[PDB]
Amino acid sequence: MNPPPPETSNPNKPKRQTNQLQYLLRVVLKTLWKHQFAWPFQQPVDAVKLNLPDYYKIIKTPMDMGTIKKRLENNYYWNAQECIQDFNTMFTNCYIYNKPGDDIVLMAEALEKLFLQKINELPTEETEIMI
Amino acid sequence: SMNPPPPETSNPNKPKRQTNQLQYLLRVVLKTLWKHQFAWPFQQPVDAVKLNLPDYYKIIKTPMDMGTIKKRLENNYYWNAQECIQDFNTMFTNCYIYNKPGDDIVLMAEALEKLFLQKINELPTEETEIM
Ligand SMILES: Cc1sc2c(c1C)C(c1ccc(Cl)cc1)=N[C@@H](CC(=O)NCCCCCCCCCCNC(=O)C[C@@H]1N=C(c3ccc(Cl)cc3)c3c(sc(C)c3C)-n3c(C)nnc31)c1nnc(C)n1-2
Protein backbone atom coordinates (compact mmCIF):
# COMPACT_ATOMS: atom_id res chain seq x y z
CA MET A 1 0.00 0.00 0.00
CA ASN A 2 1.01 3.61 -0.62
CA PRO A 3 2.30 5.70 2.28
CA PRO A 4 1.04 9.25 2.48
CA PRO A 5 2.98 11.52 0.08
CA PRO A 6 6.05 13.39 1.39
CA GLU A 7 5.16 16.52 3.34
CA THR A 8 5.26 19.88 1.56
CA SER A 9 5.00 21.83 4.80
CA ASN A 10 5.70 21.37 8.51
CA PRO A 11 4.89 23.81 11.33
CA ASN A 12 8.03 22.69 13.18
CA LYS A 13 10.46 23.09 10.28
CA PRO A 14 11.99 26.58 9.83
CA LYS A 15 11.19 28.16 6.44
CA ARG A 16 13.53 30.19 4.25
CA GLN A 17 14.09 31.73 0.83
CA THR A 18 17.49 32.27 -0.84
CA ASN A 19 18.79 33.31 -4.27
CA GLN A 20 19.94 29.73 -4.82
CA LEU A 21 16.50 28.29 -3.97
CA GLN A 22 14.84 30.81 -6.32
CA TYR A 23 17.20 29.58 -9.04
CA LEU A 24 16.35 25.95 -8.23
CA LEU A 25 12.66 26.63 -8.85
CA ARG A 26 12.80 29.12 -11.74
CA VAL A 27 15.60 27.50 -13.75
CA VAL A 28 16.43 23.99 -12.57
CA LEU A 29 13.01 22.57 -11.69
CA LYS A 30 11.36 24.38 -14.60
CA THR A 31 13.80 22.88 -17.12
CA LEU A 32 13.44 19.32 -15.80
CA TRP A 33 9.66 19.62 -15.45
CA LYS A 34 9.28 20.35 -19.17
CA HIS A 35 11.71 17.64 -20.28
CA GLN A 36 10.37 14.76 -22.39
CA PHE A 37 11.21 12.26 -19.63
CA ALA A 38 9.64 14.22 -16.77
CA TRP A 39 6.21 12.58 -16.53
CA PRO A 40 6.94 9.52 -14.33
CA PHE A 41 8.71 11.81 -11.85
CA GLN A 42 6.03 14.54 -11.63
CA GLN A 43 4.15 12.79 -8.83
CA PRO A 44 4.85 10.08 -6.23
CA VAL A 45 5.25 6.48 -7.33
CA ASP A 46 1.88 4.77 -7.00
CA ALA A 47 2.86 1.23 -6.00
CA VAL A 48 -0.73 -0.02 -6.28
CA LYS A 49 -1.30 1.23 -9.82
CA LEU A 50 2.15 0.01 -10.92
CA ASN A 51 1.86 -3.35 -9.09
CA LEU A 52 5.06 -2.79 -7.09
CA PRO A 53 4.22 -4.29 -3.68
CA ASP A 54 7.88 -4.09 -2.60
CA TYR A 55 8.52 -0.50 -3.71
CA TYR A 56 7.94 1.13 -0.33
CA LYS A 57 9.76 -1.69 1.46
CA ILE A 58 12.90 -0.95 -0.55
CA ILE A 59 12.46 2.82 -0.87
CA LYS A 60 12.30 4.33 2.62
CA THR A 61 12.72 7.96 1.55
CA PRO A 62 10.41 8.39 -1.47
CA MET A 63 10.76 11.58 -3.50
CA ASP A 64 9.39 13.07 -6.72
CA MET A 65 9.50 16.38 -8.61
CA GLY A 66 5.91 17.31 -7.75
CA THR A 67 6.91 17.27 -4.09
CA ILE A 68 10.12 19.21 -4.77
CA LYS A 69 8.22 21.81 -6.82
CA LYS A 70 5.71 22.35 -4.02
CA ARG A 71 8.44 22.47 -1.37
CA LEU A 72 10.19 25.24 -3.34
CA GLU A 73 6.92 27.13 -3.87
CA ASN A 74 6.09 26.81 -0.16
CA ASN A 75 9.57 27.89 1.04
CA TYR A 76 9.81 24.56 2.85
CA TYR A 77 13.59 24.34 2.50
CA TRP A 78 16.19 26.12 4.61
CA ASN A 79 18.85 26.04 1.89
CA ALA A 80 19.61 24.94 -1.67
CA GLN A 81 21.46 21.83 -0.48
CA GLU A 82 18.30 20.44 1.12
CA CYS A 83 16.59 20.73 -2.25
CA ILE A 84 19.56 19.30 -4.18
CA GLN A 85 19.46 16.36 -1.75
CA ASP A 86 15.81 15.73 -2.62
CA PHE A 87 16.64 15.65 -6.33
CA ASN A 88 19.47 13.22 -5.63
CA THR A 89 17.16 11.05 -3.54
CA MET A 90 14.65 10.98 -6.42
CA PHE A 91 17.32 9.82 -8.89
CA THR A 92 18.96 7.28 -6.59
CA ASN A 93 15.59 5.81 -5.53
CA CYS A 94 14.97 5.05 -9.19
CA TYR A 95 18.41 3.44 -9.59
CA ILE A 96 17.98 1.44 -6.38
CA TYR A 97 14.53 0.01 -7.13
CA ASN A 98 15.19 -0.69 -10.81
CA LYS A 99 18.10 -2.20 -12.77
CA PRO A 100 20.77 -0.77 -15.11
CA GLY A 101 19.46 -0.37 -18.64
CA ASP A 102 15.79 -0.26 -17.63
CA ASP A 103 13.89 2.40 -19.57
CA ILE A 104 12.99 4.33 -16.41
CA VAL A 105 16.64 4.32 -15.31
CA LEU A 106 17.77 5.68 -18.68
CA MET A 107 15.14 8.40 -18.23
CA ALA A 108 16.35 9.21 -14.71
CA GLU A 109 19.97 9.31 -15.95
CA ALA A 110 19.12 11.83 -18.67
CA LEU A 111 17.27 14.02 -16.18
CA GLU A 112 20.14 13.78 -13.69
CA LYS A 113 22.68 14.77 -16.33
CA LEU A 114 20.55 17.81 -17.20
CA PHE A 115 20.12 18.57 -13.49
CA LEU A 116 23.89 18.59 -12.94
CA GLN A 117 24.40 20.88 -15.94
CA LYS A 118 21.86 23.37 -14.61
CA ILE A 119 23.09 23.51 -11.00
CA ASN A 120 26.60 24.15 -12.34
CA GLU A 121 25.23 27.65 -12.98
CA LEU A 122 23.88 28.01 -9.44
CA PRO A 123 24.87 31.34 -7.83
CA THR A 124 28.03 30.58 -5.84
CA GLU A 125 27.13 32.70 -2.81
CA GLU A 126 23.97 32.00 -0.81
CA THR A 127 21.95 35.15 -0.19
CA GLU A 128 18.95 34.99 2.15
CA ILE A 129 15.85 36.73 0.79
CA MET A 130 13.01 37.87 3.06
CA ILE A 131 9.73 36.03 2.42
CA SER B 1 4.96 14.03 -32.37
CA MET B 2 1.33 15.14 -32.75
CA ASN B 3 -1.80 13.56 -31.28
CA PRO B 4 -4.89 13.00 -33.45
CA PRO B 5 -8.25 14.45 -32.41
CA PRO B 6 -9.97 12.06 -29.98
CA PRO B 7 -12.71 9.68 -31.19
CA GLU B 8 -16.14 11.23 -31.71
CA THR B 9 -18.31 11.15 -28.57
CA SER B 10 -21.38 13.03 -29.80
CA ASN B 11 -22.94 14.02 -33.12
CA PRO B 12 -26.26 15.71 -34.02
CA ASN B 13 -26.33 13.76 -37.29
CA LYS B 14 -26.20 10.53 -35.25
CA PRO B 15 -29.37 8.93 -33.92
CA LYS B 16 -29.19 9.06 -30.12
CA ARG B 17 -30.47 5.99 -28.31
CA GLN B 18 -30.59 4.26 -24.92
CA THR B 19 -31.16 0.63 -23.87
CA ASN B 20 -31.12 -1.46 -20.69
CA GLN B 21 -27.78 -3.15 -21.42
CA LEU B 22 -26.27 0.22 -22.42
CA GLN B 23 -27.28 1.51 -18.98
CA TYR B 24 -25.69 -1.60 -17.45
CA LEU B 25 -22.44 -1.05 -19.40
CA LEU B 26 -22.16 2.41 -17.85
CA ARG B 27 -23.45 1.87 -14.32
CA VAL B 28 -21.79 -1.51 -13.74
CA VAL B 29 -19.12 -2.39 -16.34
CA LEU B 30 -17.47 1.00 -16.95
CA LYS B 31 -17.71 1.85 -13.25
CA THR B 32 -16.03 -1.38 -12.14
CA LEU B 33 -13.27 -1.22 -14.75
CA TRP B 34 -12.55 2.45 -14.03
CA LYS B 35 -11.74 1.62 -10.41
CA HIS B 36 -9.41 -1.30 -11.17
CA GLN B 37 -5.75 -0.82 -10.18
CA PHE B 38 -4.69 -1.04 -13.84
CA ALA B 39 -7.37 1.26 -15.28
CA TRP B 40 -5.10 4.31 -15.42
CA PRO B 41 -3.40 3.80 -18.82
CA PHE B 42 -6.85 3.27 -20.37
CA GLN B 43 -8.73 6.19 -18.78
CA GLN B 44 -7.89 8.64 -21.58
CA PRO B 45 -6.58 8.53 -25.17
CA VAL B 46 -2.98 7.42 -25.65
CA ASP B 47 -0.90 10.59 -25.50
CA ALA B 48 1.78 9.84 -28.10
CA VAL B 49 3.44 13.21 -27.55
CA LYS B 50 3.84 12.72 -23.78
CA LEU B 51 4.86 9.06 -24.15
CA ASN B 52 7.25 9.76 -27.06
CA LEU B 53 5.54 7.28 -29.39
CA PRO B 54 5.85 8.71 -32.92
CA ASP B 55 4.65 5.42 -34.41
CA TYR B 56 1.62 4.80 -32.19
CA TYR B 57 -0.89 6.45 -34.50
CA LYS B 58 0.90 5.09 -37.56
CA ILE B 59 0.03 1.63 -36.24
CA ILE B 60 -3.26 2.24 -34.42
CA LYS B 61 -5.89 3.78 -36.71
CA THR B 62 -8.91 3.03 -34.55
CA PRO B 63 -7.86 4.23 -31.10
CA MET B 64 -10.21 3.76 -28.17
CA ASP B 65 -10.08 4.33 -24.42
CA MET B 66 -12.43 4.27 -21.42
CA GLY B 67 -12.72 8.05 -21.19
CA THR B 68 -14.18 8.02 -24.70
CA ILE B 69 -16.42 5.06 -23.87
CA LYS B 70 -17.69 6.83 -20.73
CA LYS B 71 -18.60 9.87 -22.82
CA ARG B 72 -20.26 7.80 -25.56
CA LEU B 73 -22.43 6.02 -22.97
CA GLU B 74 -23.35 9.32 -21.27
CA ASN B 75 -24.13 11.12 -24.53
CA ASN B 76 -26.28 8.18 -25.68
CA TYR B 77 -23.98 7.99 -28.70
CA TYR B 78 -24.39 4.25 -29.23
CA TRP B 79 -27.29 2.58 -30.99
CA ASN B 80 -26.91 -0.62 -28.95
CA ALA B 81 -24.68 -2.47 -26.45
CA GLN B 82 -22.73 -4.39 -29.06
CA GLU B 83 -21.41 -1.10 -30.42
CA CYS B 84 -20.05 -0.37 -26.93
CA ILE B 85 -18.66 -3.87 -26.28
CA GLN B 86 -16.87 -3.47 -29.61
CA ASP B 87 -15.18 -0.29 -28.35
CA PHE B 88 -13.87 -2.12 -25.25
CA ASN B 89 -12.55 -4.91 -27.49
CA THR B 90 -10.89 -2.38 -29.78
CA MET B 91 -9.21 -0.78 -26.77
CA PHE B 92 -7.74 -4.09 -25.62
CA THR B 93 -6.77 -5.19 -29.13
CA ASN B 94 -4.93 -1.92 -29.79
CA CYS B 95 -2.83 -2.53 -26.71
CA TYR B 96 -1.97 -6.08 -27.85
CA ILE B 97 -1.14 -4.89 -31.38
CA TYR B 98 1.13 -2.02 -30.39
CA ASN B 99 2.96 -3.78 -27.55
CA LYS B 100 4.76 -7.12 -27.08
CA PRO B 101 3.24 -10.26 -25.42
CA GLY B 102 5.35 -10.05 -22.24
CA ASP B 103 5.05 -6.30 -21.77
CA ASP B 104 3.83 -4.91 -18.45
CA ILE B 105 1.05 -2.93 -20.16
CA VAL B 106 -0.15 -6.09 -21.93
CA LEU B 107 -0.34 -7.96 -18.62
CA MET B 108 -2.30 -5.01 -17.23
CA ALA B 109 -4.70 -5.04 -20.19
CA GLU B 110 -5.19 -8.81 -19.88
CA ALA B 111 -6.16 -8.46 -16.22
CA LEU B 112 -8.55 -5.64 -17.08
CA GLU B 113 -10.00 -7.65 -19.98
CA LYS B 114 -10.59 -10.66 -17.75
CA LEU B 115 -12.67 -8.45 -15.43
CA PHE B 116 -14.51 -6.98 -18.43
CA LEU B 117 -15.50 -10.47 -19.62
CA GLN B 118 -16.70 -11.39 -16.14
CA LYS B 119 -18.90 -8.29 -15.89
CA ILE B 120 -20.50 -8.50 -19.36
CA ASN B 121 -21.39 -12.14 -18.63
CA GLU B 122 -23.96 -10.61 -16.28
CA LEU B 123 -25.44 -8.28 -18.92
CA PRO B 124 -29.26 -8.23 -19.11
CA THR B 125 -30.25 -11.08 -21.45
CA GLU B 126 -32.68 -9.01 -23.55
CA GLU B 127 -31.90 -5.57 -25.01
CA THR B 128 -34.86 -3.23 -24.47
CA GLU B 129 -35.10 0.41 -25.57
CA ILE B 130 -35.29 3.20 -22.98
CA MET B 131 -36.87 6.53 -23.98
C1 LIG C 1 -0.70 6.62 -19.96
C2 LIG C 1 -0.19 5.40 -20.68
S3 LIG C 1 -1.11 4.78 -22.02
C4 LIG C 1 -0.07 3.44 -22.37
C5 LIG C 1 1.09 3.44 -21.44
C6 LIG C 1 1.02 4.58 -20.44
C7 LIG C 1 2.00 4.91 -19.34
C8 LIG C 1 2.17 2.41 -21.47
C9 LIG C 1 2.58 1.78 -20.17
C10 LIG C 1 1.66 1.70 -19.12
C11 LIG C 1 2.02 1.12 -17.92
C12 LIG C 1 3.31 0.64 -17.77
CL13 LIG C 1 3.77 -0.10 -16.21
C14 LIG C 1 4.23 0.72 -18.80
C15 LIG C 1 3.87 1.30 -20.01
N16 LIG C 1 2.67 2.00 -22.55
C17 LIG C 1 2.26 2.60 -23.81
C18 LIG C 1 3.24 2.11 -24.87
C19 LIG C 1 4.62 2.66 -24.55
O20 LIG C 1 4.75 3.72 -23.95
N21 LIG C 1 5.67 1.92 -24.93
C22 LIG C 1 7.03 2.39 -24.75
C23 LIG C 1 7.86 1.46 -23.87
C24 LIG C 1 7.28 1.36 -22.47
C25 LIG C 1 8.19 0.53 -21.56
C26 LIG C 1 7.51 0.30 -20.21
C27 LIG C 1 8.37 -0.47 -19.21
C28 LIG C 1 7.54 -0.74 -17.95
C29 LIG C 1 8.34 -1.30 -16.78
C30 LIG C 1 7.37 -1.54 -15.62
C31 LIG C 1 8.03 -2.07 -14.35
N32 LIG C 1 8.80 -1.05 -13.65
C33 LIG C 1 8.21 -0.13 -12.88
O34 LIG C 1 7.00 -0.12 -12.66
C35 LIG C 1 9.11 0.92 -12.25
C36 LIG C 1 8.49 2.28 -12.56
N37 LIG C 1 8.71 2.45 -13.99
C38 LIG C 1 8.10 3.37 -14.59
C39 LIG C 1 8.33 3.59 -16.06
C40 LIG C 1 8.93 2.58 -16.81
C41 LIG C 1 9.15 2.80 -18.16
C42 LIG C 1 8.79 4.01 -18.74
CL43 LIG C 1 9.07 4.30 -20.47
C44 LIG C 1 8.21 5.03 -18.01
C45 LIG C 1 8.01 4.81 -16.66
C46 LIG C 1 7.22 4.33 -13.87
C47 LIG C 1 7.65 5.00 -12.61
S48 LIG C 1 6.39 6.06 -12.06
C49 LIG C 1 5.29 5.77 -13.37
C50 LIG C 1 3.97 6.50 -13.38
C51 LIG C 1 5.85 4.78 -14.32
C52 LIG C 1 5.09 4.34 -15.55
N53 LIG C 1 8.80 4.71 -11.96
C54 LIG C 1 9.60 5.53 -11.24
C55 LIG C 1 9.52 7.01 -11.04
N56 LIG C 1 10.57 4.72 -10.75
N57 LIG C 1 10.30 3.39 -11.16
C58 LIG C 1 9.17 3.41 -11.90
C59 LIG C 1 0.87 2.16 -24.07
N60 LIG C 1 0.43 1.30 -25.00
N61 LIG C 1 -0.96 1.20 -24.86
C62 LIG C 1 -1.36 2.00 -23.84
C63 LIG C 1 -2.78 2.16 -23.37
N64 LIG C 1 -0.22 2.55 -23.39
Query: Does the beta carbon of B49 lie under 8 angstroms from any beta carbon of chain A?
Result: no
Domains of chain A: 18-122 (1.20.920.10)
- What resolution (Å)? 1.5
The maximal CA–CA distance of chain B, rounded, in angstroms, is: 45
User: CA-to-CA distance for A48 and B87, rounded, in angstroms?
Assistant: 26
CA proximity to B116, closest of B56, B41, B29, B53: B29
Residue nearest to atom 18 of ligand 1 (CA): B99
Residues of B in contact with A102 (CB under 8 A): none
Count of C-beta atoms within a 10 Å radius of residue B41: 17
Buried b (16+ CB within 10 A) or exposed e, A79-108: ebeebbebbebbbebbeebeeeeeeebebb
**What are the C-alpha distances in Å from A117 to residues A71, A101, B21?**
22, 22, 58
The distance of A49 to chain B (nearest Cα, Å) reads 5
User: CA-to-CA distance for B102 and B104, rounded, in angstroms?
Assistant: 7
Amino acid at A95: Y
Count of C-beta atoms within a 10 Å radius of residue B92: 17
Q: Taking phi first (over 0 means left), then psi (-120 to 50 degrees means alpha), and beta for anything else, what does residue A59 get?
A: beta
Would you list the DSSP string of chain A? Answer: -PPPPPPS--TTSPP--BHHHHHIIIIIIHHHHTSTT-GGGSS---TTTTT-TTHHHH-SS---HHHHHHHHHTT--SSHHHHHHHHHHHHHHHHHHS-TT-HHHHHHHHHHHHHHHHHTTS-SS--B---
Residue nearest to atom 14 of ligand 1 (CA): B105
User: CA-to-CA distance for A24 and A30, rounded, in angstroms?
Assistant: 8
